[PDB]
Design a protein around this ligand. Structure first.
Ligand code: PLP
Ligand code: PLP
Ligand code: CA
Ligand code: CA
Ligand code: CA
Ligand code: CA
Ligand code: CA
Ligand code: CA
Ligand code: CA
Lengths: 299, 302
């Protein structure tokens, strides 16, 4: 049994890659698309909310407000449905329309900003909305320690247990930097020799080249006006990148060859991982790729 | 470790779907548990039947590495087959009309399916199906409507999971029907282990074939039969009664489940759940343990 969909968050499957040539290393994909909200962001939605509740920051009529690229809004929408909280999301109009439709299916109210101004414009508009709300809580995923902490506590522990502590490499897409940073932090505390790499869009190479740009790898990229506080760059053994088209193409390779329907960021992160494997061919490495969301919302 | 989720392929993710208790919607003093078949990696219960139909055919020798799998279907069965065939490297052709959603067409194509489009009735699909058979040296047609591996998969897995998760404490099972396989396979097994259990199929109120002997238009995707006729895999001798749901109520309940429970099920989940609520209300405060099958997740209908 589960008492609610909240009990289904986490404990996601880790699936071996069998048909794609992985160059004498084993690649496993952690399917965060299996979460009830269809993304890893269910984990951070749950922890940011539950810790706020414990700290006395959320009453039953507190309005939760958050700027999001989409999946955090979906995870929050779903949790707020179960908990009967009111959620308002500020988001860019440039994201997949399926994100909006998913949030609205859970009863979430969406306010739209100009996508060409990035997540900075969402964070700005959220300040304006605060003035009309008598009682609110802003999870603030780009600074809230409970974003990476969720991954440190659950995601990483699931990887360690499922692979019985045999993990050589962990590769993960970045937006807030929380899933990479929290998971890599725990992994490195237990496995001192593990290598952990973040991936960013080749068209918005903030970490590897020092500038941003438009890209199509939804959920990835840093557009708040700097590197998020929750990103811990000291954990990165190197910065990996992926082009927009290669991400789309790899997303299709995964579905055609593995029956894995991941998002565009999954295509990006997996491409980066497969390239890494090719560069480190025939070492018998156990390589784990975080698939941040499922692909249904991008078709 | 023993309670971990390491998987060899997405095939290992099929089945073992969770039961979730309903807490916020009034269920009238009975306990309603929804079995979320949307948790399957192809997002519906049809992964179970796609898996069993293909694997039994492999075992029979009906599928060689170069056998083309061919099925005339516009629904979740096509998706389930597509995903399975992606993993197993079989060529799949799915025949469906001109007039179907890009939603499902694109999902099937994402797994590598050749979707062949005809003119929208089903009669024109069958002639294309016959034409493709004639063009292929080797083929296998699963035929979800006649293949006993449809209900057998549910008899073997779906029903056993329900018994295990509720420690054999199940009073009522309610399930939407299209092929009738999930209802008939699951109810068969549950009744063998639990002789007092009541088992009810649900059909669309505006296509009440089983309850009133005719077909009509409805919007409960995945449910409903054709004439055509009642599929071979439906076993009406298991049905304690036939329940129905109108289109409007199915959509409303779909919305209610996502708003109040954070459960995003398909239209048939709304229909089946509405039928179970109407049943639970006629039997209020009996502490009945009622299981509803949620056949797919709701994303594709948004
Ligand atoms: C948020 C998100 C990411 C990046 O994850 P972070 O933990 O924020 O760095 C990648 N892909 C998708 C689809 C996302 O929603
Ligand atoms: C196939 C399907 C049904 C009906 O299930 P059967 O086992 O064919 O009777 C109900 N809902 C959806 C979404 C389906 O795809
Ligand atoms: Ca240590
Ligand atoms: Ca190092
Ligand atoms: Ca390119
Ligand atoms: Ca009551
Ligand atoms: Ca045999
Ligand atoms: Ca193929
Ligand atoms: Ca193909």
């Amino acid at each position: 049994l589960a008492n609610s969909v909240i009990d289904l968050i986490g404990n996601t499957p880790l699936v071996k890659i069998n048909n794609i040539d992985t160059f004498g290393n084993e690649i496993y994909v952690k399917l965060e698309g299996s979460n009830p909200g269809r993304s890893t962001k269910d984990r951070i939605a749950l922890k940011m909310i539950e810790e706020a509740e414990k700290e006395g920051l959320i009453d039953k009529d507190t309005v939760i407000i958050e700027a999001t690229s989409g999946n955090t809004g979906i995870g929050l929408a779903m949790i707020c449905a179960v908990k009967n909280y009111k959620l308002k999301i500020v988001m860019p109009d440039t994201m997949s329309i399926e994100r909006i439709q998913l949030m609205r299916a859970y009863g979430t109210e969406v306010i739209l900003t100009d996508g060409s101004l990035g997540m900075k414009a969402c964070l700005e508009k959220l300040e304006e909305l605060k003035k009309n709300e008598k009682k609110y809580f802003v999870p603030n995923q780009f600074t809230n320690v409970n974003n990476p902490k969720a991954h440190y506590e659950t995601t990483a522990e699931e990887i360690l247990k499922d692979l019985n502590n045999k993990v050589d490499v962990f590769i993960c897409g970045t937006g807030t930097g929380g899933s990479f940073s929290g998971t890599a932090k725990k992994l490195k505390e237990k496995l001192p020799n593990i290598k952990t790499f973040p991936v960013e869009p080749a068209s918005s190479p903030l970490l590897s080249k020092g500038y941003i740009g438009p890209h199509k790898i939804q959920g990835m990229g840093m557009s708040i006006g700097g590197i998020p506080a929750v990103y811990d760059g000291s954990l990165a053994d190197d910065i990996l990148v992926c082009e927009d088209d290669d991400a789309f193409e790899m997303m299709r390779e995964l579905s055609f060859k593995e029956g894995i329907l991941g998002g565009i960021s999954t295509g990006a992160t997996f491409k980066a991982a497969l390239d890494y494997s090719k560069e480190n061919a025939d070492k018998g490495l156990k390589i784990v790729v975080l698939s941040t969301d499922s692909g249904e919302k991008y078709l």
